[PDB]
Write a protein that binds this ligand. Structure first.
Ligand SMILES: *[C@@H]1O[C@H](CO)[C@@H](O[C@@H]2O[C@H](CO)[C@@H](O)[C@H](O)[C@H]2NC(C)=O)[C@H](O)[C@H]1NC(C)=O
Ligand SMILES: *[C@@H]1O[C@H](CO)[C@@H](O[C@@H]2O[C@H](CO)[C@@H](O)[C@H](O)[C@H]2NC(C)=O)[C@H](O)[C@H]1NC(C)=O
Ligand SMILES: *[C@@H]1O[C@H](CO)[C@@H](O[C@@H]2O[C@H](CO)[C@@H](O)[C@H](O)[C@H]2NC(C)=O)[C@H](O)[C@H]1NC(C)=O
Ligand SMILES: *[C@@H]1O[C@H](CO)[C@@H](O[C@@H]2O[C@H](CO)[C@@H](O)[C@H](O)[C@H]2NC(C)=O)[C@H](O)[C@H]1NC(C)=O
Ligand SMILES: *[C@@H]1O[C@H](CO)[C@@H](O[C@@H]2O[C@H](CO)[C@@H](O)[C@H](O)[C@H]2NC(C)=O)[C@H](O)[C@H]1NC(C)=O
Ligand SMILES: *[C@@H]1O[C@H](CO)[C@@H](O)[C@H](O)[C@H]1NC(C)=O
Lengths: 305, 69, 184
């Protein structure tokens, strides 16, 4: 079965002055009277843009070496070809990592993540070659190779079945595994709503932020070049302040709701980091933590966020 | 001198060709560091490569241990 | 503290000098802007403290769970109590926190061997009770899987199940029975 988890969201930056005033010295001097609100807002957004890279680093950099798989791949009848990297593909992704990447202005900028998608696909292929080839030994020290069916027999021991039950049913167990990996590919090729929702929420908030640059909040217009053209300076101060107050309110609402949304993405990434440790580099005994049934093994695949 | 990344335009750092561990994150895969005496910018490395001697009748068994704290 | 020196669009930042310059008819105007600005300052401080206390609570719940599972027991969760096979943990107090000292076992100095799933003897398939069959090149032994300690393959460290014609990779070797040279 599959389990999908968000680890990051998009790093955005705002420039308070360019959003509230938009390069006009009249508004910019009135803004100085509000103290340091706009250094706080930037501090908050920077603090949440650094932890988005910290979120990814702790889910995926769970290896010291980059392990590679052997050229001649005989794993006892088991076939991992749809989850192993594909050189003729974009970014050297696996076949199933592709189906996943296909399914999902004024003081505002978007910062790029520190790890590219190529680097994260490299990390997951090192985890996947470590587990196909060494079992759980590489997550405790140096990787020690073991033939794949003997590793499968150890895992059967771990759920309380004897080893002869694996060795006498090897071809049937391998056929069932291959046929069940073949169905993930259909069900996805034909479900990533948890990843789509965090994208949608962030875009819906960024659009609401820009759509507020066209409200009066109780002024004669929404344009500073219209209050600076049909009002004398003593009368345009009163009308510029009404815009400043509204735009500050809207920017600070945006920054609060991002803190509350980042605290939720953080817990999801903390759960993903625990599942990578306990289901991918080990065999778990916890009930319903690594699927439904008796956990044998787990494989990671990277997704957009 | 002047180097174009995907994070922006970077001035005052030399673009070397080797890959080290990340020291100061620039972004989109690029990091910077003070080497030798100058400031250099490079693509980060994920780690050292390793092929495991996998075959279908080979096993590796440890003969000693360490206590770690 | 420092937001107490902004005018927020009043004549003075000090209310003693707001009441010194513009009085009641006009202090209802100048004092109100100071009240409005300082209230908003205070509300921002309190909201960001509430968001940060919730992050400290998650950390303290995780530290409570590590104290129960790493200091008052031995854990099997991988990476929960350090890198390697957890043996024990000791707590230490810090100024606003806690330091765990994790003692783990890390295997070292691995050697190469030849393996087999089962042994075939007398038309029977033999499996190890707890370990692996290994060969040094000429001889077959059973060893425990985490420490190399080779022993003879006998009927006391193996069990039997079936024929040696169904499992992929059986090798032929002898399984020594102690009782026979016992009673001759
Ligand atoms: C592992 O399974 C894959 C199926 O996903 C096999 O690859 C395909 O097999 C079909 C049937 O012969 C061919 O038409 C395709 O050209 C194969 N390659 C693809 C789809 O990329 C693969 O052969 C299996 N591995 C082994 C060792 O049998
Ligand atoms: C077990 O045997 C394998 C294969 O013989 C060894 O793999 C060697 O790895 C080195 C990497 O530095 C390669 O250059 C060699 O070509 C490999 N084959 C050799 C030396 O025959 C592996 O090192 C051995 N493991 C142990 C623990 O000794
Ligand atoms: C594999 O191990 C066996 C048994 O440990 C070795 O056989 C013994 O080797 C010693 C060497 O001094 C001889 O004195 C014994 O007579 C041998 N037979 C026994 C104990 O039954 C064997 O040499 C080892 N093989 C390799 C390739 O190292
Ligand atoms: C494990 O792999 C080896 C080598 O890949 C297999 O040895 C081959 O066995 C087939 C039939 O048994 C022969 O036709 C080949 O010539 C062998 N290869 C070599 C290089 O000799 C072995 O059968 C595999 N299975 C095991 C050991 O259970
Ligand atoms: C292991 O020993 C058995 C005998 O104990 C061998 O079995 C013989 O195999 C040949 C060829 O397949 C047959 O013609 C004989 O009838 C078999 N005899 C018996 C008693 O089963 C087996 O070939 C040996 N295998 C290895 C790898 O040594
Ligand atoms: C870095 O390596 C590439 C190899 O494709 C080469 O073209 C380039 O000139 C090198 N740059 C430096 C500064 O050595």
């Amino acid at each position: 079965t599959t389990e999908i988890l968000p680890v990051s969201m998009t790093k955005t930056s705002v420039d308070c002055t360019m959003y509230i005033c938009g390069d006009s010295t009249e508004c910019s001097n009135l803004l100085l009277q509000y103290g340091s609100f706009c250094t706080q807002l930037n501090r908050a957004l920077t603090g949440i843009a650094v932890e988005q890279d910290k979120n990814t680093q702790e889910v995926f950099a769970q290896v010291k070496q980059i392990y590679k798989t052997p050229p001649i791949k005989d794993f006892g009848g088991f076939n991992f070809s749809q989850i192993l990297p594909d050189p003729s593909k974009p970014s050297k992704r696996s076949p199933i990592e592709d189906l996943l990447f296909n399914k999902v202005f004024n003081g505002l900028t978007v910062l790029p993540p520190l790890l590219t998608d190529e680097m994260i696909a490299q990390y997951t292929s090192a985890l996947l070659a470590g587990t196909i080839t060494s079992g759980w030994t590489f997550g405790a020290g140096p990787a020690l190779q073991i033939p794949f069916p003997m590793q499968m027999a150890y895992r059967f021991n771990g759920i309380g079945v004897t080893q002869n039950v694996l060795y006498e049913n090897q071809k049937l167990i391998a056929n069932q595994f291959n046929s069940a990996i073949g169905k993930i590919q259909d069900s996805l090729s034909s479900a990533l709503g948890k990843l789509q929702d965090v994208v949608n929420q962030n875009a819906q908030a960024l659009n609401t932020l820009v759509k507020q640059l066209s409200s009066n909040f109780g002024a004669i217009s929404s344009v500073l070049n219209d209050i600076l053209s049909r009002l004398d300076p003593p009368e345009a101060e009163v009308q510029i302040d009404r815009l400043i107050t509204g735009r500050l309110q809207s920017l600070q609402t945006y920054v609060t709701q991002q803190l509350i949304r980042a605290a939720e993405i953080r817990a999801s990434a903390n759960l993903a980091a625990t599942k990578m440790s306990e289901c991918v580099l080990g065999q778990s005994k916890r009930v319903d933590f690594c699927g439904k049934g008796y956990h044998l093994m787990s494989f990671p695949q990277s997704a957009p966020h | 001198n002047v180097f174009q990344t995907r994070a922006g335009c970077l001035i005052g750092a030399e673009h070397v060709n080797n890959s080290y561990e990340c020291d100061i994150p620039i972004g989109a895969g690029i990091c910077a560091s003070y080497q030798t005496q100058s400031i250099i910018a490079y693509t980060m490395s994920l780690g050292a490569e390793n092929s495991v001697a996998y075959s279908n009748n080979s096993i590796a068994i440890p003969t000693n241990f360490t206590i770690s704290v | 503290v420092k937001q107490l020196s902004s005018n927020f669009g009043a004549i003075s930042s000090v209310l003693n000098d707001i009441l010194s310059r513009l009085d009641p008819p006009e202090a209802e105007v100048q004092i109100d802007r100071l009240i409005t600005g300082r209230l908003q300052s205070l509300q921002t401080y309190v909201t960001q403290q509430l968001i940060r206390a919730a992050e400290i609570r998650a950390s303290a719940n995780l530290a409570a769970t590590k104290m129960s599972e790493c200091v008052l027991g031995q854990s099997k969760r991988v990476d929960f109590c350090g890198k390697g096979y957890h043996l024990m943990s000791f707590p230490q107090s810090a100024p606003h926190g806690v330091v765990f000292l994790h003692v783990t076992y890390v295997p070292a100095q691995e050697k190469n061997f030849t393996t087999a799933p089962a042994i075939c003897h007398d038309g029977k398939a033999h499996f190890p009770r707890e370990g692996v069959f290994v060969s040094n090149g000429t001889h077959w032994f059973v060893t425990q899987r985490n420490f190399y300690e080779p022993q003879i393959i006998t009927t006391d460290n193996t069990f039997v199940s079936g024929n040696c014609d169904v499992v992929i990779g059986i090798v032929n070797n002898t399984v020594y029975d102690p009782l026979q040279p016992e009673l001759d």
